[PDB]
């Protein structure tokens, strides 16, 4: 077996503690090469003339080239060491350790996890674990106070097809007036996009971090929303744009005035002075060269404390967490101290990061709790909507990303279908609601936090900005209540099955020819298995169901019942039908 292709490291995503006495270990190797992989360990200082402990590393999954094994090590003391024992297709074991590969346990070496400090155990909020959140674009959700509307605020109709200039008067007031609907849907939190004082129409160029933009509301109405949302089991996550600021930022506009004379000149990455010409950027901007957005020197103690204050202020109003905008561009130092702040000032506050590449570094339990699962959305779009990938690839992609980070974080990724920055999903699906529903079913059942884009729950359709940003349909008789109802159930069903919340995943069936997939979430003994038949035809499949831990399941959706013949579960699914089989456990 190709040992060059075998991996492990006493850290990060391959060696972390799941408590102050237990230690998780993952190891990978080529798909095929390894059959059995057991981990032999013992307390580090333990005397040589003693016995080692054992533990069978279970094959947790396989992507398009590797096989992943995972096993839990019991460390009564917080100190531990350990070596692997990888077997191949021909029972020819090998020992894997910090020194290399060798036949003799000793010559193999031994990995080491010095000590497991209780303060370094990845720990995320409890409500977070079982959430289901609703992304809200304030301006397009609901207008509850037409006074605050900006001039020429075009009319609010289902026939609207907004362009880059539209305004509709969406505000905080309406959001409050709709709390009832929101509550009915079953969401347990509302992640808002930016809402602080800003000139633009998106509010990403903060003008006053400490004040709600006028057109949306005021500190009173916000507290109103926070209080009114809370007493309904719904929390409030806000978009913190720390990477860069708005050119109306008090600090910045001063540097434009005073110049080198300003006490805030070293608060930005400015070229020379003059600064902020019509377009020629005489300073560093968050993007390629956007004028209205000068980068904030987050390494600077002044800048750092200012935002940390902007942080303490808003949490005083009772918000439950932050969605870190373009997080991957501020010093880990800042990000670490941020957590310490936020968390001392509130243990259940959630820090969700937005990184568009590998976020492993920020996900070691000392910075973000989770980040946007941009990977999930790709595997979802290409599998259900475009049909660019079959269920074997869909299994691969999902599985490879699942192994990307410590479970604490894996379990917390915000799985979304779309955003305000993308065409609506029902559109990506062509309009074939059969496909949409299927994807949603998967979303409401897969590992991680489902994130609902305002509107999709009842039928919205559209192209990336600004067509996806159409005004929310409230007219009872223009909302796909079938959908809305479909959502509610899934959502409730998700809250019910303690397996679909804190469980893990495991691939159960993949048929590249049938384009049918299926996985299994398991918490204790409880098993729930989702059978997704993604194809415009009716099919039948025999899912390997060892009669061991369950030989009869109930379809949580259509209540139908069913059992397994000789450990083989026969099933037939209507086109695009999806099945959620429970094992009662
Ligand atoms: O405040 C800034 C915004 O922050 C937040 O957004 C962040 C993203 O979430 C995050 O992922 C990241 O983006 C990276 C991206 O994911 C990477 O892939 C890469 O981008 C490259 C991309 O992959 C390539 O495809 C290509 O882009 C092509 C693109 O695919 C294609 O569609 C087209 O794009 C044109 C648009 O279709 C067209 O609409 C227009 O774009 C307008 C836009 O419509 C308009 O609204 C305005 O944008 C505003 C926006 O409305 C505000 O909301 C705010 O955006 C924030 C987001 O909301 C946050 O979620 O501010 C924006 C401006 O201040 O202006 C746009 C500009 O015209 O034109 C587009 C063409 O220019 O063609 C392109 C081909 O270029 O190349 C990409 C870059 O090479 O890298 C990204 C960054 O690393 O970061 C985001 C924040 O920067
Ligand atoms: Ca309004």
From Swiss-Prot:
Record function comment: Hydrolyzes pullulan efficiently but only a small amount of starch. Endohydrolysis of 1,4-alpha-glucosidic linkages in pullulan to form panose. Also cleaves (1-6)-alpha-glucosidic linkages to form maltotriose.
EC number of this enzyme: 3.2.1.135
GO terms of biological process kind: carbohydrate metabolic process
Full protein name: Neopullulanase 2
Binding site for Ca(2+): 143, 145, 148-149, 169, 171
Pfam families: Alpha-amylase, Alpha-amylase_N, Malt_amylase_C
Binding-site residues, substrate: 244, 323, 420-421, 465, 469
Residues annotated as site: Transition state stabilizer: 421
Family of this protein: Belongs to the glycosyl hydrolase 13 family.
Source taxon at top rank: Bacteria
Subunit structure: Monomer.
One GO molecular-function entry: metal ion binding
Cofactor (UniProt): Ca(2+)
InterPro entries in the record: Glyco_hydro_13_cat_dom, Glyco_hydro_13_lg-like_dom, Glyco_hydro_b, Glycoside_hydrolase_SF, Ig-like_fold, Ig_E-set, Malt_amylase-like_C, O16G_dom_2
Catalytic activity: Hydrolysis of pullulan to panose (6-alpha-D-glucosylmaltose)
Organism: Thermoactinomyces vulgaris
Enzyme class at the top of the EC tree: hydrolase
Keyword set, alphabetical order: Calcium, Carbohydrate metabolism, Glycosidase, Hydrolase, Metal-binding
Cofactor binding: number and manner: Binds 1 Ca(2+) ion per subunit.
Residues annotated as catalytic: 325, 354
């Amino acid at each position: 077996m190709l040992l060059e292709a075998i991996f492990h490291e006493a850290k990060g995503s391959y060696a972390y503690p799941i408590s102050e006495t237990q230690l998780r270990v993952r190891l990978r190797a080529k798909k095929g090469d390894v059959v059995r992989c057991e981990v032999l360990y013992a307390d580090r200082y333990a005397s040589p003339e003693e016995e080692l402990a054992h533990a069978l590393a279970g094959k947790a999954g396989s992507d398009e080239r590797f096989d992943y094994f995972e096993a839990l090590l019991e460390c009564s003391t917080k100190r531990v060491k350990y070596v692997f024992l990888l077997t191949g297709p021909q029972g020819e074991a090998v020992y894997f350790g910090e020194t290399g590969f060798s036949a003799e346990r000793s010559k193999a070496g031994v990995f080491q996890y010095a000590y497991i400090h209780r303060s370094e155990v990845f720990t995320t909020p409890e409500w977070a674990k079982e959430a289901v959140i609703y992304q809200i674009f304030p301006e397009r959700f609901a207008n509850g106070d037409p006074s605050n509307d900006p001039p020429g605020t075009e009319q609010w109709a289902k026939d609207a097809r907004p362009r880059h200039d539209s305004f509709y008067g969406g505000d905080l007031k309406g959001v409050i007036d709709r709390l009832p609907y929101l509550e009915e849907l079953g969401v347990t939190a509302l992640y808002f996009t930016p809402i602080f004082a800003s000139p633009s129409h998106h509010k990403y160029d903060t003008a006053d971090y400490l004040a709600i933009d006028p057109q949306f509301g005021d500190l009173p109405t916000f507290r109103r929303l926070v209080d009114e949302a809370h007493r309904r089991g719904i929390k409030i996550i806000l978009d913190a744009v720390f990477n860069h600021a708005g050119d109306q930022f008090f600090a910045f506009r001063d540097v434009l005035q005073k110049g080198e004379q300003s006490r805030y000149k070293d608060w930005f990455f400015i070229e020379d002075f003059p600064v902020s010409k019509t377009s020629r950027t005489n300073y560093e901007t968050f993007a390629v060269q956007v004028p209205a957005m000068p980068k904030l020197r987050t390494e600077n103690p002044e800048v750092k404390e200012y935002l940390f204050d902007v942080a303490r202020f808003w949490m005083e109003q009772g918000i439950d967490g932050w969605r870190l905008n373009v997080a991957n561009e501020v010093d880990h130092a800042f990000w670490r101290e941020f957590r310490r702040l936020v968390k001392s000032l509130n243990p259940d506050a959630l820090i969700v990061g937005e990184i568009w590449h590998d976020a492993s570094g920020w996900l070691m339990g000392d910075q973000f709790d989770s980040v946007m699962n941009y990977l999930f959305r790709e595997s979802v779009i290409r599998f259900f909507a475009t049909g660019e990938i079959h269920a074997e690839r869909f299994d691969a992609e999902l599985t490879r990303a699942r192994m990307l980070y410590p479970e604490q974080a894996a379990q917390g990724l915000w799985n979304l279908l779309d955003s305000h920055n993308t065409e609506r999903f029902l559109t990506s699906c062509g309009g074939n609601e059969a496909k949409f529903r299927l994807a949603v079913l998967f979303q409401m059942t897969y590992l991680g936090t489902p994130l609902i884009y305002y509107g999709d729950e009842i039928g919205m359709a559209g192209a990336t900005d600004p067509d996806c940003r159409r005004p929310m349909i409230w007219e009872e008789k223009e909302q796909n209540r079938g959908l809305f109802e479909f959502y509610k159930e899934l959502i409730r069903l998700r809250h019910r099955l303690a397996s679909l919340t804190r469980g893990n995943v495991r691939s159960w069936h993949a048929d590249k020819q049938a384009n049918l997939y299926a996985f299994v979430r398991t918490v204790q003994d409880q098993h729930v298995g989702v059978v997704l038949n993604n194809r415009g035809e009716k099919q039948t499949v025999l899912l390997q169901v060892p009669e061991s831990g369950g030989k009869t399941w109930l379809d949580c959706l259509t209540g139908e019942e069913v059992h397994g013949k000789q450990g083989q579960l026969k099933l037939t699914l209507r086109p695009y039908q999806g099945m959620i089989l429970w094992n009662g456990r």
